[PDB]
Write a protein that binds this ligand. Structure first.
Ligand code: MGD
Ligand code: MGD
Ligand code: SF4
Ligand code: SF4
Ligand code: SF4
Ligand code: SF4
Ligand code: FES
Ligand code: 4MO
Lengths: 975, 109, 109, 48
């Protein structure tokens, strides 16, 4: 279809919608300043004017009709592009020679060069507005703004926060925030999209200002006259632009760009890191990034100031009475080896626990389990996935077969219906939500939200239900019951790929529509309209998180979600599946490499005689037959005099494991404690030997994100002082016992594991070069799997097994503890703040921990904002400050876990856990309300990403610009 | 006296290799001792005649030096003079010096 | 295994820190050994061709050199020549090279 | 510097630059054939 003629040359189309898309593929030069591929056409620069069938139109927005005659070289088309560029340079001073955006990628600078323009007809004019340095991470230079609206199109349709707008009604239209409110005071989420998508220095990250070049260091008081003198003398742009290109070229000497995978959430955002020595100038996302492209949250683009903190540990520590004395590497490595062997030949290998981190790479987890199993001889291996992804894994293993997402993030945005169950996705997996919100806004995507808090995802949704605590499984079974009775369920799928229909049908018997209304608190009217839409949609993506996982029957509710998709045929279909949102950056990756004490790498259980020999052949030590203990149950082993030593790397489990009053007492009850964190954390205080680890940027390796995407890291900087990387430390520790491991770099560790792992059979560092990534199960040759179970399931018959599960009564505190206390994440604060609060800008929007109370709740209890309150539980007590917020309901407060101290929600959490995979029940906690104060410093200020008011709109409203009588189209100006 | 092919490299330690690399510089120092002492004398004379302190002051206070210079030199006169100077080079390219040669010779008489 | 926070810094002595800082220079010497020996050869050649002694004499006796220069160059002729030279730059700013361009082209024919 | 030089030579290899620089050299040669002796009194008459 479609045959065209480019300047006489006959041509044919493949799939391109626009003329510009064709001219770009055909390598034909055409200016296109405001066109960004990820943003779509905006029609704000008018630099792409071409003659299609005699008509002068913008090629970025030009439907590819049949038999069109494109003209990209006529004196009239070039003369028109020129007129457009002169109106661009009217709002640009252009000082590349001394500008930080002169790095060979400034769309304006590179286009002036391309257009062969040396004298602008419309001289530059200063805009009557001021620069807004209010935000601690980026600035706005109005005098350099070209009203391209790339930032506006990104904030509204990409990030879908809707803060950025352009007031076209003004004499000088400028980029406004809310109602022309300063950025710090506005509803700015601080993602950094606006700066990523701006083509010039108008929207720029403050970390580059006076740091990028050599002449950029000059103070503005002397640099401004320097510029005026330059303009007066210069002849044509061609000459001075060439000089600027030389400074830009010299910039390669001092600036380094290294690809990395974000160590915040499990989204798996890949991006370059522009560093000059130890300082970071900018996080530059690259279009080809697999899980995000040019998308970031606040943390990924600006939360890296922790690597350069004074609290960082450089030299290893050893306990010396009332203090930690600095000690040499070899003398510390000998001490740990001395005690480990002493305890091994006195109590047994089982007396040594080995806790891995969900921050460490795939190799780091593999070597930590190799040290415990192939050196020490015990199976005591676990990460923070006991309380995080245990129901997320167990729920899927019991029904479909693999402990991971059914597809990639792209499948979520394509899906007709997105079901969200217990997930604050906006403030936990942010880049993921900018796909859900994007599709709900642009494609009219069906979104159903189901959790006790009305968060950003809930308000931007088509349907929002509020079930009671531990009652999600009830309505899940009720929907399935309704769907199967009314013949709405996909029966073809049930016969073809489902094993055990009639058995599961009998288990749905007590789940009548009226039963769900009595237990959950969801009216049968909305309860039936959500069930009708689940079966009406072509593809359903079920996204669940801690509001499902951290419960008494956490695994039961997880299994209920998967077979509900199974019942409606939402598997092996492009745009549907089960998506347990992995919270940690490498919680999936660590799990994949035998970090479960129940399984070896590649999810193969430690009970196979054959797999126990497959690993023994290449290790040379008899693999332990005794199954290990989970992170949760080994805490009790200490009090019973069974656990002697523990090796926890990069995890603050003495702050994130259920009941920290008990796990603090359990920590001081063991003989040896070796902690491997980058900072001196709460867990690190109770240690005997501390080993200073090297963070994400100070090492290379691999990270398997939520969509089972194994990405590769590039070392940004080499270890600070003597802080060896985590993998190096593990190797040296194993060697000091007697292992003799030889890995020149982390790539060598991967090739040892990849052979042994069946799913990771064909994973090579060469296949992960640059922004390349693989999705397991990946064949030995290199065939990955973006979507799971396309032709068969991982079971003998190739069918999925339904799991009948009954609603286990949620263990509630009751009697005196009536006001339930919730727990979760913030957008800017990644837990306690041992990485985020270090970035001092993140501490301005959110400075402290708070207790979210509703206007209904703050009336019956007689409380205001900025007041001290005491929430007491049968496990602990907290000294939190009350925050009045419109999100929560009834008598259900919210305590986000962003304080490693006295106001931590881990004191109040109970020892009670899930009835299948030892998952601590955090979303099952209640407390009593006491008052300590009436007035004080408010926990959340006006300068936050939630206090402001957004102004939603689609696109940039380019017609408002075109409405102005000063605007004249370049094409009809020549006419 | 059987047939063998394996080779065992000698242990050139971190400090051993360093001391060899340093001896490399120390040798070229001896080889150019003549010029080294000559340059040092010359440098001592530059400090003696304030050349070195003059440069040290220039760089130590260069922030002021440059600001002083650019502020005074950013006049309308200077900007025009410098631009016209550049313009002169361009126009002196369009000139055909071939015919200016005999034109000069007639003025001589 | 109680909760402790006190930290005890290691004793990096005056000479210890010095030997680490010196090793820093000694490493960059090895890293640039190639250029170091090259520069030394070039410098040896400069002394070989009297360039270095010529500069040494210049600075060692610069007091005389400068006095000789300024005294001879303080003529009425030199003062006027140099002032008029400066005057020429100023007046060549008032000139509009735009109209001198076609003026040149007509002389060419 | 490899980039620096390549950037410089490519931009400076115009027909204009080549002619300007050649004519500049030509000017030195022709300013040798000039007899500055008779230009000296020629200047003095213009002064009045
Ligand atoms: N009440 C309550 N408690 C909860 C939860 C809840 O909802 N409510 N959720 C629970 C869950 S699901 C989880 S998994 C946990 C989260 O707990 P964790 O998995 O422990 O996560 P963090 O505390 O963010 O990170 C631990 C430390 O790793 C260090 N670190 C960072 N990068 C590196 C690196 O590359 N290497 C090394 N070695 N160290 C590094 C940092 O200094 C940081 O302090 O919280 C649990 N706690
Ligand atoms: N910015 C940021 N990102 C993070 C983290 C962080 O601290 N900061 N930590 C990471 C980690 S360790 C994890 S595991 C994830 C966690 O993130 P996800 O679990 O989204 O994160 P949560 O904030 O725990 O959101 C769970 C939500 O479930 C709902 N909910 C609670 N109880 C119930 C219930 O009984 N029923 C239903 N239906 N819903 C309920 C509540 O509205 C609650 O906010 O995020 C990860 N990402
Ligand atoms: S943003 Fe680009 S075009 Fe504008 S002054 Fe800087 S380098 Fe030049
Ligand atoms: S502020 Fe918006 S319109 Fe102005 S230069 Fe930046 S992206 Fe373009
Ligand atoms: S909310 Fe802030 S960081 Fe996010 S796109 Fe808008 S201006 Fe940029
Ligand atoms: S926390 Fe998640 S969404 Fe934010 S930058 Fe990191 S990977 Fe991307
Ligand atoms: S790219 Fe077409 S108007 Fe800007
Ligand atoms: Mo987690």
């Amino acid at each position: 279809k479609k045959t065209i003629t480019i300047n006489g040359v006959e041509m044919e189309a493949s799939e391109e919608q626009t003329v510009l898309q064709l001219l770009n593929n055909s390598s034909i030069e055409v200016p296109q300043v405001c066109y960004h591929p990820s943003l779509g056409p905006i029609e704000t620069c008018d630099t792409c004017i071409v003659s299609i069938n005699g008509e002068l139109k913008r090629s970025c927005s030009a439907e590819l009709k049949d038999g069109d005659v494109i003209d990209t070289l006529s004196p009239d088309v070039k003369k028109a592009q020129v007129i457009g560029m002169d109106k661009i340079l009217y709002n640009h001073e252009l000082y590349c020679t001394v500008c930080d955006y002169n790095n060979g990628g400034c769309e304006i600078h590179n286009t002036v060069k391309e257009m062969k323009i040396n004298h602008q007809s419309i001289p530059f004019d200063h805009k009557p507005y001021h620069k807004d340095e209010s935000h601690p991470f980026y600035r706005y230079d109005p005098d350099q703004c070209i009203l391209c609206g790339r930032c506006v199109e990104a904030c509204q349709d990409v990030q879908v926060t809707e803060t950025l707008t352009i007031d076209w009604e003004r004499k000088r239209p400028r980029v406004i925030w809310d109602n022309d409110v300063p950025i710090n005071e506005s509803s700015c989420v601080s993602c950094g999209h606006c700066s990523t998508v701006c083509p010039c220095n108008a929207m720029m990250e403050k970390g580059m200002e006076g740091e990028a070049g050599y002449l950029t260091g000059i103070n503005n008081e002397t640099l401004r006259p320097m510029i005026e003198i330059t303009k007066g003398v210069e002849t044509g742009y061609g000459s001075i632009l060439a000089i600027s290109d030389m400074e830009s070229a010299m910039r390669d000497e001092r600036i380094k760009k290294t690809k990395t995978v974000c160590t915040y959430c499990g989204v798996g955002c890949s991006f370059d890191v522009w560093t000059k020595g130890r300082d970071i100038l900018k996080v530059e996302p690259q279009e080809e990034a697999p899980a995000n492209g040019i998308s970031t949250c606040v943390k990924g683009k600006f939360g890296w100031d922790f690597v350069n903190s004074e609290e960082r540990l450089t030299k290893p520590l050893i306990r010396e009475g009332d203090h930690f004395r600095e000690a040499e590497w070899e003398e510390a490595l000998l001490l740990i080896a001395s005690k480990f062997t002493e305890l091994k030949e006195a109590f047994g290998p089982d007396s040594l626990a080995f806790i891995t981190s969900s921050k460490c790479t795939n190799e780091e987890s593999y070597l930590m389990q190799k040290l415990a199993r192939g050196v020490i001889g015990t199976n005591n291996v676990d990460n923070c996935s006991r309380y995080c992804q245990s129901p997320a894994t167990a729920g899927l293993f019991r029904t479909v077969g693999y402990g991971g997402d059914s597809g990639s993030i792209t499948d979520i945005a394509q899906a007709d219906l997105v079901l969200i169950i217990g997930s604050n996705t906006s403030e936990s997996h942010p880049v993921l939500s900018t796909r859900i919100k994007r599709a709900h806004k642009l494609r009219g995507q069906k979104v159903i939200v189901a959790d006790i808090r009305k968060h950003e995802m809930a308000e931007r949704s088509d349907l929002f239900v509020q079930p009671r605590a531990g009652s999600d499984i009830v309505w899940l079974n009720a929907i399935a019951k309704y769907l199967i009775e009314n013949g709405k369920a996909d029966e073809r799928f049930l016969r073809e790929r489902v094993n055990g229909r009639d058995e599961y049908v009998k288990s749905l018997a007590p789940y009548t529509l009226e039963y769900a209304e009595e237990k959950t608190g969801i009216d049968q009217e909305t309860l039936i309209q959500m069930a009708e839409m689940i079966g009406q949609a072509d593809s359903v993506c079920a996204l669940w998180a801690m509001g499902v996982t951290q419960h008494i029957g956490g695994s039961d509710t997880s299994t209920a979600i998967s077979n509900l998709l199974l019942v409606t045929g939402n598997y092996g279909k492009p745009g549907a599946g089960s998506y347990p949102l992995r919270g940690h950056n490498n919680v999936q990756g660590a799990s994949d490499f035998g970090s479960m004490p129940d399984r070896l790498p590649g999810y193969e259980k430690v009970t196979d005689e054959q797999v126990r020999q497959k690993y023994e052949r290449v290790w040379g030590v008899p693999l332990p037959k005794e199954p290990g203990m989970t992170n949760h149950e080994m805490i009790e082993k200490i009090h019973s005099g069974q656990l002697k030593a523990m090796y926890v790397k990069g995890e603050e489990m003495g702050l994130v494991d259920s009941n920290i009053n008990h796990v603090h007492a359990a920590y001081e009850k063991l003989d040896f404690f070796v902690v491997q964190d980058i900072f001196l954390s709460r867990t690190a205080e109770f240690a005997d030997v501390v080993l200073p680890a090297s963070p994400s940027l100070e090492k290379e390796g691999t990270f398997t994100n939520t969509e089972r995407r194994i990405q590769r890291l590039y070392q940004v900087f080499e270890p600070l002082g003597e802080s060896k990387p985590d993998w190096q430390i593990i190797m040296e520790v194993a060697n000091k016992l007697g292992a003799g491991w030889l890995y020149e770099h982390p790539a060598d560790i991967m090739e040892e594991a990849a052979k042994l792992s069946p799913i990771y059979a064909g994973v090579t560092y060469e296949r992960l070069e640059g922004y390349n990534s693989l999705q397991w199960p990946v064949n030995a040759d290199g065939k990955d799997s973006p979507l799971l179970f396309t032709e068969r399931f991982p079971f003998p018959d190739g069918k999925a097994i339904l799991y009948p599960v009954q609603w286990t009564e949620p263990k509630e505190f009751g009697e005196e503890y009536d006001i339930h206390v919730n727990n979760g994440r913030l957008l800017e604060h990644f837990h306690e703040g041992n990485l985020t609060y270090k970035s001092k800008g993140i501490s301005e929007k959110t400075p402290e921990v708070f207790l979210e109370i509703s206007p209904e709740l703050a009336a019956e209890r007689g409380i205001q904002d900025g007041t001290l309150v005491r929430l007491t539980s049968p496990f602990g007590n907290v000294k939190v400050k009350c925050l009045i917020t419109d999100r929560v309901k009834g008598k259900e407060v919210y305590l986000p876990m962003n304080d490693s101290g006295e106001a931590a929600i881990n004191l109040l959490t109970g020892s009670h856990a899930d009835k299948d995979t030892d998952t601590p029940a955090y979303k099952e906690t209640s407390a009593k309300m006491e008052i300590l104060k009436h007035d004080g410093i408010s926990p959340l200020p006006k300068i936050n990403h939630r206090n402001g008011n957004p102004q939603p709109q689609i696109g940039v409203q380019v017609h408002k610009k075109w409405a102005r009588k000063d605007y004249i189209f370049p094409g009809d100006a020549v006419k | 006296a059987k047939a063998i092919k394996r080779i065992q490299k000698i242990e050139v330690t971190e400090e051993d290799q360093r001391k060899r690399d340093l001896r490399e510089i120390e040798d070229a120092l001896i080889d150019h001792k003549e010029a080294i002492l000559e340059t040092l004398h010359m440098l001592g004379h530059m400090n003696e005649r304030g050349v070195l302190p003059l440069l040290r002051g220039l760089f130590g206070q260069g922030d002021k030096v440059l600001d002083i210079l650019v502020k005074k030199a950013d006049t309308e006169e200077t900007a025009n003079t410098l631009k016209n100077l550049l313009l002169l080079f361009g126009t002196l390219g369009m000139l055909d010096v071939k015919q200016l040669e005999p034109l000069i010779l007639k003025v001589n008489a």
